[PDB]
Structure formats: structure tokens, C-alpha cells
Amino acid sequence: TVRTLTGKVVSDKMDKSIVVLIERRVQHPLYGKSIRRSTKLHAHDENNVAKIGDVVTIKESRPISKTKAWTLVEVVEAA
């Protein structure tokens, strides 16, 4: 009953934090062609298990820092 997202890690330089890129495909409101839209989310990684290139899952939570509100749940595939 919690909101989860699936994405690909694009950075792990900072301490205990990962940057994951989420991708979605939506229709253009007027021209009707399906277009690709992406967003960047800062998540929380307690043990630095995540790396660059892996496909991961995150879930929403209470704030952990200024820009982090998501926590890693599981690593689906390792780079």
C-alpha cells in the first residue's frame, strides 16, 4: 500500500545516496504522439549496495534530507 518506482541508477558519488532516473511514456495533449519524459529522484542508500547502471526499486517515505524522500527497496538487476 506504499508508492514504489522502478528506475536506473545514474550516480552514487555522495555518501549513502543514489540518483535514480525514472522514465515514463505519455501522449502529447494536442498532437497525440507518444513522447518520452524523464525525472531525477534522490534516494537513500544506507549501506551503499547500489552502483551505477543497476536497475533498482524505491519507495516513498518521510524526508531524510533537503532533497531525499525515497528509500531503496531492492536491487532487481546488478550492473
Are the C-beta atoms of 60 and 69 separated by less than 8 Å? yes
Q: Any residues with CB less than 8 A from the CB of 79 and at least 6 apart, and which?
A: 9, 51, 52, 53, 54
Residue 75: CB atoms within 10 A of its CB come to 15
- Residues in 45-64 that interact with RNA by CB under 7 A: 60-64
Q: Out of 8, 41, 49, 59, point to the residue binding RNA (CB under 7 A).
A: 41
- Unique residue bearing C-alpha cell 536491487: 75
- Site track for RNA across 20-39, x = CB under 7 A: ----xx-x--xxxxx-xxxx
Give the residue with the Cβ less far from RNA, 27 or 74. 27
- Which stretches of the chain bind RNA, using CB under 7 A? 1, 3, 11, 13-17, 19, 24-25, 27, 30-34, 36-42, 44, 60-69
